[PDB]
Amino acid sequence: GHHGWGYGQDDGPSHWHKLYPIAQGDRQSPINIISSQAVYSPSLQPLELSYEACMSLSITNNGHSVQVDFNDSDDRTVVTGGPLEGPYRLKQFHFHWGKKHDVGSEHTVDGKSFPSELHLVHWNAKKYSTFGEAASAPDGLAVVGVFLETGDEHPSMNRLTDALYMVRFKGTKAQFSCFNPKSLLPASRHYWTYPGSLTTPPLSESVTWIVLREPISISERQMGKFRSLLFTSEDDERIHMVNNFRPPQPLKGRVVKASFRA
Ligand SMILES: CC(=O)Nc1nnc(S(N)(=O)=O)s1
Ligand SMILES: [Zn+2]
């Protein structure tokens, strides 16, 4: 659903459970990843992100985040391997960030947050006929999370942040052709994985999370651009889009697997 949920004081994460009871379920996301507790799992096949150069459609400010959607009408742009059984098509990717440098990411590692976190959302189109249907099944979705830390300016990120002024207001969009999501990935394919859920309503527990170990780097300037976005529409009082993240949720005995040893 998408109703009276947001990130404000009255409709924020702490209130979601009222309209979305699944909010206090057995496998909610995000979580705090205690690295020493992750289970090295060598049996898992290599994680592969096979993305196309021009499958991107538009970039949109939907009031919760800035999102880039893709054509999923076919099987070209998918994630596979790792804990996944079969390919999952990329539907869209978006970000979560904070008002300050020490907050922003949804998942945290050993209690530490990153200024932002990228989410590439995929669904099992092979066995379910619609994202809505896949979203209701425990094995219907796969979300790849990528942490962002501030450092060197990120090349492909320039085009994305440059387009943020145009979509500064809620409900606005622009064409965003030929953006290869592969450009927002780190060199390493090491990851952590665990059964979880969507981090925004409906909070469906149908997500196989794959959180990459190595973060990508963007500049503070680029980060500042995300913070210039607004939760509000054109003729409404301005409220900047920041702290659009859900805090860590109870692990509840779940096992986090790792594709590497540390
Ligand atoms: C329609 C759709 O994709 N909904 C999502 N809700 N939460 C998501 S997230 N932050 O877990 O990637 S994606
Ligand atoms: Zn997300």
How far apart are alpha carbons 214 and 93 in whole angstroms?
18
Structural domains of the chain, ranges and CATH numbers in brackets: 1-262 (3.10.200.10)
Ligand 2 centroid vs 46 CA: distance in angstroms? 24
Structure tokens at 153: 């300016």
Nearest ligand (C-alpha, residue 118) = 2
DSSP H helices, the chain, are: 16-19, 131-134, 155-162, 220-227
Q: How far apart are the first and last CA of the chain?
A: 39
Resolution (A): 2.0
Read off the tokens for 78. Answer: 């998918």
In degrees rounded to 5, what are phi and psi of residue 193? -145, 145
Question: Count H helices, E strands: the chain?
Answer: 4, 15
- Pick the residue whose CA is nearest to atom 3 on ligand 1: 121
Q: Ligand 2 centroid to 242 CA: how many Å? A: 14
Q: What SS3 class is residue 66? A: strand
**Amino acid found at 15:** H
Residue 199 Cβ < 6 Å to ligand 1: yes
Tokens of 8: 């404000």
Match 């805090």 to its residue by tokens. Answer: 247
What one-character DSSP code corresponds to residue 23? G
Q: Going by CA atoms, what residue is nearest to atom 10 of ligand 1?
A: 199
Tokens 């009408």 correspond to 73
Render the burial of 202-230: b for 16+ CB within 10 Å, e for the rest.
bbbbbbbbbbbbebbbbbeebbebbbebb
Catalytic residue positions, numbered: 64
Nearest protein CA to atom 8 of ligand 1, as residue: 198
Task: Assess whether the C-beta atom of 200 lies below 6 angstroms from ligand 1.
Answer: yes
Least distant ligand from the CA of 92: 1
CA-based radius of gyration for the chain: 17
Pairing of strands 45-50, 78-82: antiparallel
User: What is the residue whose two structure tokens read 């530490």?
Assistant: 112
Would you state the structure tokens that stand for residue 174, as one six-digit string? Answer: 């622009």
Rounded Cα gap, residues 182 and 70, in angstroms: 13
Rounded to the nearest angstrom, the distance between the alpha carbon of 54 and the centre of ligand 1 is 22
Residues around ligand 2, an ion, CB closer than 5 A: 119
Beta bridge partners of 32: 108
Q: How many CB atoms lie within 10 A of CB 119?
A: 23
What's the gap between Cα 106 and its chain centre? 9
Closest ligand 1 atom to 131 CA:
1
Which ligand places an atom closest to the C-alpha of 120? 1
The one-letter amino acid code at 225 reads: K
**Is 4 within 8 Å of 16 (Cβ atoms)?**
no
Determined by X-ray
* Ligand 2 centroid distance, CA of 42 (Å): 28
DSSP class of residue 244? Answer: -
